[PDB]
Amino acid sequence: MHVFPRYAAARPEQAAELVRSNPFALVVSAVDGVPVATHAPVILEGDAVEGGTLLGHMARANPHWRSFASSPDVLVVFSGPHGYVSPTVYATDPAAPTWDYAAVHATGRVELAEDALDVVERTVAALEAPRDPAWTPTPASREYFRALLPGVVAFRVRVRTEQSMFKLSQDLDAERYARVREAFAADNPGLADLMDRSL
Amino acid sequence: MHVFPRYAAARPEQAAELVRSNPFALVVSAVDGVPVATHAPVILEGDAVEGGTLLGHMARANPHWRSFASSPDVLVVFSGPHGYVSPTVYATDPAAPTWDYAAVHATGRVELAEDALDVVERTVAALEAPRDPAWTPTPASREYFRALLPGVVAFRVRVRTEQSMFKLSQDLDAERYARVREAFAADNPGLADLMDRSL
Ligand code: HEM
Ligand code: HEM
Incomplete structure (x- = not known):
């Protein structure tokens, strides 16, 4: 990722906001010299991505985690809303x-x-708490969780560096920008809500 | 990515189908020993992912491509529909x-x-052709494209290995599966259309 100045985050809290709202992330490591990636839920501990702690889990049957033992650097990608911009919209x-x-x-x-157990319990709370209704592990779910423990591997990442990209047509003139926004408002309201949060 | 047997592709053409329908991919390489990833449009040449050719482009100002010169192995991730499965749905x-x-x-x-030029022109056709209406570069767009060439770097990948994951609640019993599908039909019809394509 290269972040063009025009596409940089406007306020430095928009990064943590994206990360909290899009926990289904891509965890990437260099198994041998080749990238390997797992799609896993990853949550943020603290106010800032930069310098904070990420927590995630994956299947013990997924051999990817066996490459974490040496504590290599990993890359975690959080993806927010996205949408193709067709010149048909520009006119x-x-x-x-x-x-x-x-x-x-x-x-x-x-x-x-x-x-x-902490990791997976914190991940539940992260995903369920904003929802409506939210799900709170019944006490038998907590025991069920314990029975699932042999099959899960949890991990943590101390964030050394962080990069944010908000590529939201800000380089567009007034007229073309309006067309782009109104098409996404119809088609993709999460993306349109972000182009308001960029002004 | 580890593919649990229950989540494997049902027909081997579903991979190419996903790739063609979700071209905004993640291109991942091991800059030094650390993964670096760029979000870029990547299209497929041929009938099969496995053994076919991927084509993509990114900004020349994005230094990521400077790491491709030695022809390292890269990983390209295509992501289809996805959705959180809450136990609230299971009941x-x-x-x-x-x-x-x-x-x-x-x-x-x-x-x-x-x-x-070929790469970016083929990518246009890939994205616009299924759309309604489709956009065909006017002749002045073709000249505009040529003026943009200094700012773009195109690349290709010969696919050595391919892995597909279709994690679509097939391990669910009859009743819970119905609940999961009907919630996504309401909320996420691309995901629900895939759980039909898995039966
Ligand atoms: C909070 C929301 C949660 C989400 C979104 C989630 C999601 C996932 C995903 C995507 C995988 C596959 C990882 C991979 O491919 O390697 C996985 C694996 C697994 N997780 Fe979670 N999980 C959650 C909570 C939990 C909890 C509370 C437990 C309790 C211990 C748990 C235990 C497991 C187990 C045992 C596996 C391996 C299953 C298998 O071998 O097929 N998860 N989870
Ligand atoms: C067909 C649909 C297309 C899509 C979805 C698309 C998308 C993108 C994206 C996401 C980037 C950023 C890459 C990065 O971060 O490094 C980019 C860069 C770029 N692409 Fe494309 N593109 C398309 C077609 C074209 C065409 C036809 C040209 C004509 C030459 C072109 C020329 C460029 C240029 C010059 C840049 C760099 C812009 C900059 O420096 O900010 N693209 N494109």
């Missing part, structure tokens, strides 16, 4: 398409987490 | 949440593509 005669999106990339040293 | 007393999703991971040797 100008010379144009070129693009893709609008928001993402946060966090890099740091990974570590296997011994308290897998 | 059973012991349960644990999960995330349903479809993805294709393709690994191979990357190469800088000298015909960037």
Whole structure:
């Protein structure tokens, strides 16, 4: 990821906001010299991505985690709303398409987490608490969780560096920008809500 | 990515289908020993992901491509529909949440593509052709494209290995599965359309 100045985060709290709202992340490591990636839920501990702690889990049957033992640097990609921008929307005669999106990339040293129960319980609360209705583990779910523990591996990442991208057509003139926003308001309201949060 | 047997592709053409329908991919390489990822449009050449050719582009100002010169192995992640599965939907007393999703991971040797114009023109056709209405570069767009060439770097990947995941609650019993599907039909019809394509 290269962040063009025009597409940088406007306020530094928008990164944590994206990360909290889009926990189904991509966890990436360099198994040998080749990237390997797992789709896993990853939550944030603290106010800032930068310098905070990420917590996640994956299947013990997924051999990816066996590569975390040496504590290599890992990259975690959080992806927010995204949408293709067609020149059909622009209605100008010379144009070129693009893709609008928001993402946060966090890099740091990974570590296997011994308290897998904490991790998965915190992840539940993270996903269920904003929902309506929210789900709270009944006491038998808590015992069920314990029975699932042998099959899960939890990990943590101390974020060394963080990069945020908010590529939301801000480089567009007034008229073309309005067209882009109103099409996403119809088609993709999460993306349109972010182009308001960018003004 | 580890693909649990129960979540494997049912027909081997579902991978190419996902890749064609979700071209906004994540291109991942091991800059030094650390993963670096760029969100870029990537299209498929041929009938099969496995053994086919991926084509993509990114900004010349994005230094990521400078790492492709040695032709390292790269990983390209295509992400289809996905959705959180809350135990609230299950309405059973012991349960644990999960995330349903479809993805294709393709690994191979990357190469800088000298015909960037072909690549970007093929990508336009890929994105616009299924749309309604489709956009066809006017002749002045084709000249505009040429003026943009200095700012773009195109690349290609010959797919050495491919992995597909269709994690779509197939391990669910009859009753719980129905509840999961009808909630996504309301909330997430792309995901629900895939759980039909899995039966
Ligand atoms: C809070 C929301 C949760 C979500 C979104 C979620 C999601 C997931 C996902 C996507 C995987 C696959 C990882 C991979 O491919 O390696 C997985 C694996 C697993 N998780 Fe979670 N999980 C949640 C909570 C929990 C809880 C509370 C437990 C309790 C211990 C748990 C235990 C497990 C187990 C045992 C597996 C492996 C299953 C298998 O072998 O197929 N998860 N989970
Ligand atoms: C077909 C649909 C297309 C999509 C979805 C698309 C999308 C994108 C994206 C997401 C980037 C950012 C890459 C990065 O972060 O490094 C980019 C960069 C770029 N692409 Fe495309 N593109 C398309 C077609 C084209 C065409 C036809 C051209 C003509 C040459 C072109 C030229 C460029 C240029 C010049 C840049 C760099 C812009 C900058 O420096 O900010 N693209 N494109």
